[PDB]
Amino acid sequence: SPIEEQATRLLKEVPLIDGHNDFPYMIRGWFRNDINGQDAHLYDMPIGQTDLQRLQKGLLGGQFWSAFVPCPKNPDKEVGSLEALRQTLQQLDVIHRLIERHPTILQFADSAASIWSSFRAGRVASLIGIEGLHQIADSVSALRMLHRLGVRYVTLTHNCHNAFADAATVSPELHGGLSRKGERLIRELNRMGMMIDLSHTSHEAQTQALRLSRAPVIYSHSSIYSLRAHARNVTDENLHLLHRNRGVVMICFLRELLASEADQATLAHVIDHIIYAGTRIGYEHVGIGSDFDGMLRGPDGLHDVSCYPALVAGLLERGVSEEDVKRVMGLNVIRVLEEVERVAAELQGAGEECLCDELDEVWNEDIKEQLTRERERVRKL
Amino acid sequence: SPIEEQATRLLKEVPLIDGHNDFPYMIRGWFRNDINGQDAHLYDMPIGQTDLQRLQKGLLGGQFWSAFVPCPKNPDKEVGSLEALRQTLQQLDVIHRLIERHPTILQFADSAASIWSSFRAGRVASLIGIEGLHQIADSVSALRMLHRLGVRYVTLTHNCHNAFADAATVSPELHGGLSRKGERLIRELNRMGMMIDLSHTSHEAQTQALRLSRAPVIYSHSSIYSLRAHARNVTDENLHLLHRNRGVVMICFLRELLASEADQATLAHVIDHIIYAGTRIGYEHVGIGSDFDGMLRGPDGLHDVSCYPALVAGLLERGVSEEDVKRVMGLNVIRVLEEVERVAAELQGAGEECLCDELDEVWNEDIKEQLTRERERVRKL
Ligand SMILES: [Cl-]
Ligand SMILES: [Cl-]
Ligand code: NI
Ligand code: NI
Ligand code: NI
Ligand code: NI
Structure with a gap:
């Protein structure tokens, strides 16, 4: 087909950089971060939507690997918060060990130049992000050390409110957007060169962050509200503020976020969401944020x-x-x-x-x- | 004087690299890790034995800055251990901020080549070490991330027993040297390229570590047992095993470790301890490990x-x-x-x-x- 060769040519000219993949947490679930003598399994996985063979097959140029840990559920809140910090270093460690053990496939990147040099060499540009500010254990010092370890974006929340911002899926609201600490952290994130991620955050937390941020932000894995109404999706109001911010909305493959009935979701729905955003706020503010391995099943055509x-x-x-x-x-x-x-x-x-x-x-x-x-x-x- | 010009010439030819300085913990005590608008004080400190003006005056070539935090004293042992990990990242953060804010004086180094290139430029080669394995919170993953943050040596204990080894100053003994975990950690420390430090560890823990280690180790700040008997000093047995290991004993300026009466200690005692070790195991296995800012007062001539x-x-x-x-x-x-x-x-x-x-x-x-x-x-x- 002439359209398939056009797609293959494009995939070789420029890197397709995915915004969010939770393959590191699948390694935590399946192997328990012990990948010694598991190359055969890492190349051909018995579970999940990601392995090193299929990663080559899809011609992916780059990837922000998620260093996610769950929201703390301990009755003692001090232990849960501190436990999340230790688990974060475990997930950053297995991401670094995954990259270093497979240098022919994966190469670490922490900048625009390092993405390109990785892509010239024929490697998947491997970047890192954390999915929630619960992961830093209220420590801005720890956050600066996470930046030094290679973390390049921070999702402000997951499915739990923290001291800095409100999550989308949790009610009632704690801060009503960003807290007073959260507003100060936006300045610090802009200063250190940490990319702000607004996925999993409430609509009001997005509106405030987009007006307050001096650097452009992302939605690492979120979809459009107008096509499918969900707390996790982005409203037309916040899409307009994303345009002024000069940010990018990276469209999610989650079936819940693409259609009302989950089993009806498809590749065509993902394309509809990309075209909607590209038409209204321009194609220079839209991306791809699969959320592969953050779901059991994907849409028809994006399995x-x-x-x-x-x-x-x-x-x-x-x-x-x-x-x-x-x-x-x-x-x-x-x-x-x-x-x-x-x-x-x-x-x-x-x-x-x-x-x-x-x-x-x-x-x-x-x-x-x-x-x-x-x-x-x-x-x- | 011709001997003073000889000393000044030597200080310019090769870097004097000190093994241990706790100036980062003085910044924690005095400023509480808030050094914004405190340059005047950092250059001329109202407390302690270290500041940026006196650091230039002494012609110091390099420095292993200690990222020490105290042994956990909480009744809940889980919280204390996890709290030590968060405090470690705070101390690593203020060390990095101290180096970055004064690039004319301090330059970060994590290798032999980076020490030399720092010394060519006229900078103090700024390396990092942690004073105790209580700082990692039982996480070998965290330890590998500390290595990635720039930590180049690890003191196995401070003044408390941990899961890996026995401290010198605490009785009764827990493991009787290294634990079974400690023996495995020696292999991992050798593998990752982390320098083993045997200061603050028990005599039996030293003997075992020196026989088991495949790389050379250090004593970042310890003195000789024969000249002054103390649990913190190195025995003639362990000095011989240090020779076979190819390690270096970096002599301490602590007044308690140099003489029986603390106020009698002097520069001459430090020279006696260097000459003793240099005579018996050769001068290629002796160093300087001041422990400045780990004491209130120093010896006469090394204040x-x-x-x-x-x-x-x-x-x-x-x-x-x-x-x-x-x-x-x-x-x-x-x-x-x-x-x-x-x-x-x-x-x-x-x-x-x-x-x-x-x-x-x-x-x-x-x-x-x-x-x-x-x-x-x-x-x-
Ligand atoms: Cl799942
Ligand atoms: Cl003191
Ligand atoms: Ni995720
Ligand atoms: Ni997510
Ligand atoms: Ni110290
Ligand atoms: Ni000490």
């Missing part, structure tokens, strides 16, 4: 990671121009990460002050007086 | 970080040859870090399997059967 060439061919079939299809594939999400890094370099270059944690006093006034007296003795030598 | 030229001049005065003085200053600790990296590259290059954590089952057998059934449906398409 696993090998099906990306069908999506690219489907968009070209509807009359979306090559330049616009390339934008939806990856050029848009590259631009946002590029602009997030430029905004961070500007704010750091202008010596903007970082956000410090609420740290307890460790020394009493007796200890401080001994130390000051001791310093003045050294001055008198 | 703060500006006093390193007096130590170099003092060694030359006793008749230690220039080549041997250069070894004690930094060449030895560079070699160990170089050999730790070569051993790691060999073991990783020979595909040695990494140590995985005891992770809980998250999915029940019902969830796994749904996933396998779902996979076979996709296979039949």
Whole structure:
């Protein structure tokens, strides 16, 4: 077919960068983060929608691998929050070990330049994101260390309210959008060069974040509200604010978010959602955010990671121009990460002050007086 | 003086690399990790033995900055252990922010090559270590992420027993040296390229670690037992095993470890301890591990970080040859870090399997059967 060869050519010209895949949590469920002597299984998995053979087959250019851990359910809230931080480092560790053990397929990337150099070499550009601010355990210091470990976006919530923002699927509302801490964290996320992700957050939390953010944000895996009304989808109001923010909505393959009856969902619905957003706010603000391995079953035509060439061919079939299809594939999400890094370099270059944690006093006034007296003795030598 | 100009020349030829300084914990005590608009104080501190002006004055070539947090004292042991992990990321964060905010003085280094390139530029080579395995919260995954954040040595204990090894100052003994987990961790530390530190560990834990380790280890801040008997000092038995291991004992300035009466301690005692070790196991296995800012007061002649030229001049005065003085200053600790990296590259290059954590089952057998059934449906398409 001439349309299939056009899709294959496009997939080789520019990287298709997917916004969210929970394959690291499947490794946690199945192998319990023990991948020693499991290459045969990692290439041909007995479960799920992702493995290293099907990842090659679908011609995927890049991937934001999710380092998700569940919302804490412990009665002791201190332990649950701290347990989420330890589990986050376990998931970041298995993502790094997965990339390092398969250097012919996967290559780590943390920037626009590293995505391209990975794509030139024929590798899947492997980026990292965390799915919820419950993962940092109220520590902005920890968040900066997660950035240093290679995390490049942060979903503000999952399916639970935290100290910073409101989740979409939980009622009643706690903060009514962002908290006062959340507003300060937006500045710190812009300063450090962390990409803001607004999937799983409430409509009011999106509206506030889009007006307050100085860098462009993403929806790593969310769909359109007008076509299918759901708390997880993006309203026409927030789509307009995403345009002004210069962000990208990466369309989700979740069957619940594409249609009212889940088993009726298809590839055509995903294309309808991409075209809706591309028509109304332009094709430079739409992306692909599968959420593969965050679901049991996918839509008809997008059952696993090998099906990306069908999506690219489907968009070209509807009359979306090559330049616009390339934008939806990856050029848009590259631009946002590029602009997030430029905004961070500007704010750091202008010596903007970082956000410090609420740290307890460790020394009493007796200890401080001994130390000051001791310093003045050294001055008198 | 001709001996002072000889010391100054040596300090410019090769970097004096100190094994342990707790200036990051002083920033935690004094500023509470909030150094915004505190440059004047960071250059001229009202407390302690370290600041950025005196650091320049002493002509220090490199420094292993301690990311120490105290042993957990909570009745709930789970919270205390997890709290230590969060505090570790806070201390690593303030060390990184300290280095980045003063790029003319400090430059981050994580290898032998990065130490030299930092020293060519006229910067203090800023490395990182953690003072105790209580800091990782029983997570080997976390430890690998600490390595990725720039930690290059790990003290096995502080003043508390942990799941891996016995501390020196605590009785009764728990494991009697290393635990069965501790023995496995030695292999993993050698594999990842993490330098083992045996300061604060019991005599039996040292003996076992020195025989079991495949890479050379250090004592980041410990002194000689024969000259002054203390649980924290190194015995003649362990000094001999350090020679076979090819490690380095970095001599401590703690007044308790140099003499029986603390106020009698001096620079001459530190030189006696260096010469003792250098005479018996050779000068290629001795270093300098001040422990500045881990004490209120230092010895007479080594009151703060500006006093390193007096130590170099003092060694030359006793008749230690220039080549041997250069070894004690930094060449030895560079070699160990170089050999730790070569051993790691060999073991990783020979595909040695990494140590995985005891992770809980998250999915029940019902969830796994749904996933396998779902996979076979996709296979039949
Ligand atoms: Cl699932
Ligand atoms: Cl103190
Ligand atoms: Ni997810
Ligand atoms: Ni999700
Ligand atoms: Ni210390
Ligand atoms: Ni110490």
